Design a protein around this ligand. Structure first.
Ligand SMILES: Nc1ncnc2c1ncn2[C@@H]1O[C@H](COP(=O)(O)CP(=O)(O)OP(=O)(O)O)[C@@H](O)[C@H]1O
Ligand SMILES: [Ca+2]
Ligand SMILES: [Ca+2]
Ligand SMILES: [Yb+3]
Lengths: 143, 485
């Protein structure tokens, strides 16, 4: 979409002490993460060699914009994930609680103990409020 | 208590054929799953019952609800219920035109034939009355009156064909005038013969019970997840099976976008009516309204059949929302609402509101970096501290899972005030964009409520004084640690 391109290109200038929209692979990962991804050092490589077989290490929009072009394929399941979050949140408070997790779980078969359940919530919990918000639910589902 | 209609009175307002809605009671119980329908042209019910073929997505022309062609899909869309509305009629006609050509052979058009029995039904419905006789070029005709102002109709005594023409001095929405001419209706090909079409049943939604979804999962794919030692991967894995076997939908060649359980439900439903005698083919021809993201419709009344086989009919959109909330979305049932809601649908520019719990929480949670950026991509429509889009990336750090809640709250309450700092000095610079100043005065408010929250979970501006902004490493984090006690 326009925004899709708008987004990437938008961040591409947040950190580019070059001004010509042609950063380095030293920050390529710094960008993909501040935007919502977590690429491994291995991936930040094989790709920065195929499409960017240039031999300079300078990444410009045309390059970066095309690379995202592919990753943002299967990962885009963001829509389902968000709809999934809403399935758990039975009271529609915007947060997923341990109790609610038990329900979704028992109804799917896997019966769990109040012990185990509270263990799951606490693992997904990132800011320690005892509940999981969509932001967190996303991490736990992507990250 | 919510003012809804029930049983017989509700079935009457639905437009569905009674026999059919009854046959549907079975499925709702068997599969334990709510079936919600959209209004059904009330003048189409008898046609459907008598076995007239219903229409698929390859025919978008609207049906009529008045005049001799009530119930059918008139080729001339000004005879449809969208009568008098120029833009709609035009879109209607363009649609019929595409159906006739882009699907040549499958969809055609033929002269409307009102038989002896239909005329009677139209009289009972007070839609048209058989008028006086008339002869034209040696042909016997009987006029058909209607309280309509633009047209006049008459039917042939020989083959029962209905004709129409504009009235003296009157003009068409499209600015036309013309004499006597057949009324053509949209038809589909069946064994080399064109048969007229009528409205079909449009599912508004389908809400199946989570247990009913389970059955959709291979019992050995689930096992491989139910037994994952690590929890964080076990959860993500359980969620991915829900998405995969119950939430995810895909575009089909003719049934529009729908999931797989939905396809089965479709089939069961069409089989259910066949068992009762319907001889026209399918009666439900495509996915639900929740995937109609481009041209979403908003009906005042939804006809519901619950898993106990009962008939409910909501009175208004708000009521449809209460019902779904109280009996489905908050009661262990699979459900998802149209993605276009709370947005401007692209197709028809519709703006249908719906209650979204994730947003209720927005005011008290801080944004992830992405959301921070994508809100500088949409903000940059009506028109360098990457440190903020970093802190926010720090706040939601999965590494946090090896610490204690006490710990988590501490570092988060810190990583927050951190972000609440960079934003502060940015607003301390130039109000670059008049409306950007808002996004920040806003984030600041969110960040505030978020921090203030974690604190009460244990023990804001009060503490925003005694803290370092001064030099920039783990020296600031020091004073902090002590302050919280
Ligand atoms: N102009 C258009 N372009 C593309 N799709 C359209 C469209 N108008 C309607 N649709 C599609 O058609 C569906 C709306 O129902 P329709 O198939 O048009 C007939 P209906 O709801 O049974 O009403 P009817 O009684 O007037 O015939 C939506 O799911 C939407 O995808
Ligand atoms: Ca909740
Ligand atoms: Ca949390
Ligand atoms: Yb339809």
């Amino acid at each position: 979409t326009e925004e899709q391109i708008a987004e990437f290109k938008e961040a591409f200038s947040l950190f580019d002490k070059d001004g010509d929209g042609t950063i380095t692979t030293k920050e390529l990962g710094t960008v993909m993460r501040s935007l919502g991804q977590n690429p491994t050092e291995a991936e930040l490589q094989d790709m920065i060699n195929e499409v960017d077989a240039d031999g300079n290490g300078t990444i410009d929009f045309p390059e970066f914009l095309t690379m995202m072009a592919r990753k943002m394929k299967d990962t885009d399941s963001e829509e389902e994930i968000r709809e999934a979050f809403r399935v758990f949140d039975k009271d529609g408070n915007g947060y997923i609680s341990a109790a609610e997790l038990r329900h979704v779980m028992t109804n799917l078969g896997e019966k769990l103990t109040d012990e185990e359940v509270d263990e799951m919530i606490r693992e997904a919990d990132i800011d320690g409020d005892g509940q999981v918000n969509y932001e967190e639910f996303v991490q736990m589902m992507t990250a | 208590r919510i003012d809804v209609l029930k049983g017989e009175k509700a079935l009457k307002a639905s437009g569905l054929v009674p026999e059919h809605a009854d046959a549907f009671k079975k499925i709702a119980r068997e599969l334990n799953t709510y079936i919600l329908f959209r209004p059904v042209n009330k003048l189409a019910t008898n046609l459907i019952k008598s076995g007239v073929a219903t229409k698929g997505l390859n025919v978008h022309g609207k049906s009529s609800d008045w005049g001799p062609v009530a119930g059918y899909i008139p080729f001339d869309q000004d005879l449809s219920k969208k009568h008098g509305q120029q833009l709609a009629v035009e879109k209607g006609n363009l649609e019929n035109k595409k159906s006739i050509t882009e699907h040549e052979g499958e969809i055609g058009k033929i002269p409307l034939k009102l038989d002896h029995l239909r005329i009677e039904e139209l009289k009972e419905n007070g839609i048209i009355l058989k008028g006086k006789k008339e002869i034209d070029n040696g042909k016997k005709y009987y006029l058909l009156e209607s309280n309509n102002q633009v047209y006049e109709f008459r039917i042939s005594d020989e083959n029962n064909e209905v004709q129409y023409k504009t009235k003296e001095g009157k003009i068409t929405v499209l600015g036309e005038k013309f004499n006597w001419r057949n009324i053509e209706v949209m038809a589909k090909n069946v064994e080399g013969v064109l048969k007229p079409l009528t409205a079909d049943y449009d599912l508004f939604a389908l809400a199946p019970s989570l247990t009913e979804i389970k059955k959709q999962i291979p019992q050995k794919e689930w096992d491989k997840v139910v037994n994952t030692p690590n929890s964080l991967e076990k959860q993500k894995g359980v969620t991915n099976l829900l998405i995969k076997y119950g939430i995810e939908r895909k575009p089909d060649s003719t049934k529009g976008t729908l999931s797989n359980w939905q396809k089965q439900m479709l089939d069961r439903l069409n089989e259910a009516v066949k068992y009762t005698g319907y001889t026209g083919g399918d009666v439900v021809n495509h996915g639900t309204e929740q995937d109609n993201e481009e041209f979403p419709e908003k009906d005042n009344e939804i006809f519901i059949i619950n898993p106990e086989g009962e008939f409910i009919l909501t009175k208004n959109w708000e009521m449809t929302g209460r019902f779904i909330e109280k009996n489905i979305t908050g009661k262990d049932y699979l459900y998802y609402f149209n993605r276009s809601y709370n947005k401007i649908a692209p197709g028809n520019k519709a703006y249908i509101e719906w209650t979204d719990p994730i947003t209720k929480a927005k005011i008290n949670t801080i944004p992830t970096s992405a959301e921070f950026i994508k809100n500088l991509s949409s903000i940059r429509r009506s028109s360098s501290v990457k440190k903020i889009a970093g802190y926010l990336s720090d706040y939601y750090n999965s590494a946090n899972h090896i610490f204690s809640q006490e710990k988590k709250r501490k570092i988060s309450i810190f990583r927050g005030i951190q972000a609440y700092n960079e934003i502060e000095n940015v607003l301390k610079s130039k109000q670059i964009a008049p409306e950007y100043k808002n996004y920040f005065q806003y984030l600041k408010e969110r960040i505030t409520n978020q921090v203030q929250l974690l604190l009460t979970h244990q023990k804001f501006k009060l503490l925003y004084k005694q803290l370092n902004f001064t030099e920039n490493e783990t020296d600031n984090f020091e004073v902090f640690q002590k302050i919280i006690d």
